Write an enzyme that holds these catalytic residues in place. Structure first.
Site, PDB file in Angstrom:
ATOM      1  N   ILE A   1      -3.005   2.912   6.143  1.00 18.72           N
ATOM      2  CA  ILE A   1      -1.616   3.202   6.484  1.00 18.72           C
ATOM      3  C   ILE A   1      -1.593   4.496   7.280  1.00 18.72           C
ATOM      4  CG2 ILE A   1       0.737   3.383   5.609  1.00 18.72           C
ATOM      5  CD1 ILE A   1      -0.724   0.798   4.824  1.00 18.72           C
TER       6      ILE A   1
ATOM      7  N   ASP B   1      -1.442  -6.929  -8.282  1.00 18.97           N
ATOM      8  CA  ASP B   1      -1.932  -5.549  -8.343  1.00 18.97           C
ATOM      9  C   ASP B   1      -0.749  -4.641  -8.683  1.00 18.97           C
ATOM     10  OD1 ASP B   1      -3.836  -3.571  -8.341  1.00 18.97           O
ATOM     11  OD2 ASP B   1      -3.842  -3.300  -6.165  1.00 18.97           O
TER      12      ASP B   1
HETATM   13  C1  9XK Z   1       3.063  -0.816   3.595  1.00 17.34           C
HETATM   14  C2  9XK Z   1       3.749   0.539   3.494  1.00 17.34           C
HETATM   15  C3  9XK Z   1       5.112   0.643   3.786  1.00 17.34           C
HETATM   16  C4  9XK Z   1       5.739   1.869   3.686  1.00 17.34           C
HETATM   17  C5  9XK Z   1       5.000   3.006   3.292  1.00 17.34           C
HETATM   18  N1  9XK Z   1       5.590   4.314   3.167  1.00 17.34           N
HETATM   19  C6  9XK Z   1       4.650   5.240   2.792  1.00 17.34           C
HETATM   20  N2  9XK Z   1       4.993   6.632   2.539  1.00 17.34           N
HETATM   21  C7  9XK Z   1       4.032   7.606   2.049  1.00 17.34           C
HETATM   22  O1  9XK Z   1       2.900   7.296   1.884  1.00 17.34           O
HETATM   23  C8  9XK Z   1       4.497   9.031   1.724  1.00 17.34           C
HETATM   24  S1  9XK Z   1       4.833  10.105   3.152  1.00 17.34           S
HETATM   25  C9  9XK Z   1       3.335  11.106   3.350  1.00 17.34           C
HETATM   26  N3  9XK Z   1       2.175  10.780   2.470  1.00 17.34           N
HETATM   27  C10 9XK Z   1       0.948  11.522   2.572  1.00 17.34           C
HETATM   28  C11 9XK Z   1       0.843  12.665   3.601  1.00 17.34           C
HETATM   29  C12 9XK Z   1       2.001  12.990   4.478  1.00 17.34           C
HETATM   30  O2  9XK Z   1       1.920  13.867   5.270  1.00 17.34           O
HETATM   31  N4  9XK Z   1       3.242  12.220   4.364  1.00 17.34           N
HETATM   32  C13 9XK Z   1       4.384  12.537   5.208  1.00 17.34           C
HETATM   33  C14 9XK Z   1       4.757  11.697   6.245  1.00 17.34           C
HETATM   34  C15 9XK Z   1       5.850  12.018   7.033  1.00 17.34           C
HETATM   35  C16 9XK Z   1       6.573  13.175   6.787  1.00 17.34           C
HETATM   36  C17 9XK Z   1       6.203  14.012   5.748  1.00 17.34           C
HETATM   37  C18 9XK Z   1       5.110  13.693   4.961  1.00 17.34           C
HETATM   38  S2  9XK Z   1      -0.709  13.324   3.465  1.00 17.34           S
HETATM   39  C19 9XK Z   1      -1.583  12.187   2.592  1.00 17.34           C
HETATM   40  C20 9XK Z   1      -0.494  11.400   1.737  1.00 17.34           C
HETATM   41  S3  9XK Z   1       3.173   4.456   2.585  1.00 17.34           S
HETATM   42  C21 9XK Z   1       3.652   2.912   2.999  1.00 17.34           C
HETATM   43  C22 9XK Z   1       3.018   1.667   3.101  1.00 17.34           C
END
Ligand code: 9XK
Length: 286
Positions: free
Chosen positions: A20, A125
């Site tokens: 992702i 899962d």
């Molecule tokens: C299939 C699917 C559909 C929607 C979806 N939305 C997701 N959102 C996230 O995973 C959280 S946002 C985020 N996560 C992480 C980092 C990160 O920087 N962000 C983020 C993105 C945009 C703005 C601010 C923070 S670093 C490693 C983990 S997975 C995902 C997977």
């Protein structure tokens, strides 16, 4: 650079059979999540999974799918961006959730699984990583993600045994450890372990020593099957043990009584005097 209006960003996580990435919808000025699959992979799935998302569309807590196609070396699925996973939020909260939060989550999570089952699929899962909170005005909403391991269960699929474990071992049902084909009951039993996971901070079959990896599954299965539900849930409201007992009593092709299971936790919720304001533990950080 992707689908004419999407710009690919940094990698934010991984799902089944793909990674992702963060992205931006440039025309709409909105961030998205983008799942990539190598076009030449030996077992392509992404376009299958996207067909499942497209079919689930409109269901509460199902992420919106904005675009699917192929660019360069990758098949592409563009989704609305969601917030942190329940595992992330559990860790951010020091791996302890209040009873109110667990019951708020349980109410929605039972409904997500029921919805998927209403669409003739089992998720297979069920785990904290595959439930994500929404963003902004949807921040009170639990989403479920990742249909890469999903399977259509219906006319119900036949009873089959001896089938390798398809999911996370920690949350797998006892039936799954016995090699039985997964069905609706197993999604719900997995949810039951997730709820006790949130209550305890860990499950008693976590962190077991093993080497060759098959040995690890053997040991998890053994501990799970020798741990009575009343011991697992000791010191916590009886509704969680009743929930797990109900799921373990379901027959292979039974339609679970989702309304009964939600009402279990709703009655406890009301006995505690909690308010259904959707105020989770993480919403109270200052
Ligand atoms: C299939 C699917 C559909 C929607 C979806 N939305 C997701 N959102 C996230 O995973 C959280 S946002 C985020 N996560 C992480 C980092 C990160 O920087 N962000 C983020 C993105 C945009 C703005 C601010 C923070 S670093 C490693 C983990 S997975 C995902 C997977």
């Amino acid at each position: 650079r992707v689908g004419n209006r999407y710009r690919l960003g940094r990698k934010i996580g991984s799902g089944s059979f793909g990674d992702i990435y963060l992205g931006t919808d440039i025309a709409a000025g909105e961030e998205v999540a983008i799942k990539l699959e190598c076009v030449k992979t030996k077992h392509p799935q992404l376009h299958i999974e996207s067909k499942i998302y497209k079919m689930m569309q409109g269901g509460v807590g199902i992420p919106t799918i904005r675009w699917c196609g192929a660019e360069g070396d990758y098949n592409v699925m563009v989704m609305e961006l969601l917030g942190p996973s329940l595992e992330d939020l559990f860790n951010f909260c020091s791996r302890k959730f209040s009873l109110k939060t667990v019951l708020l989550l349980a109410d929605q999570m039972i409904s997500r699984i029921e919805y998927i089952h209403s669409k003739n699929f089992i998720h297979r899962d069920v785990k904290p990583d595959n439930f994500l909170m929404g963003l902004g005005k949807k921040g009170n909403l639990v989403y479920i993600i990742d249909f890469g391991l999903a399977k259509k269960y219906r006319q119900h699929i036949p009873y089959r045994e001896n089938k390798n474990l398809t999911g996370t071992a920690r949350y797998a049902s006892i039936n799954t450890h016995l090699g039985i084909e997964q069905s609706r009951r197993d999604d719900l039993e997995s949810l039951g372990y997730v709820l006790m996971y949130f209550n305890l901070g860990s499950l008693p079959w976590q962190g077991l020593k093993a080497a060759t990896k098959r040995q690890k599954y053997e040991r998890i299965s053994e501990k799970k099957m020798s741990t009575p539900i009343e011991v697992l849930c000791k010191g916590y409201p009886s509704e969680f043990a009743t929930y797990l007992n109900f799921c373990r009593s379901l027959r292979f092709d039974d339609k679970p009584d989702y309304s009964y299971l939600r009402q279990l936790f709703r009655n406890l919720f009301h006995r505690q005097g909690f308010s259904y304001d959707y105020v989770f533990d993480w919403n109270m950080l200052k």
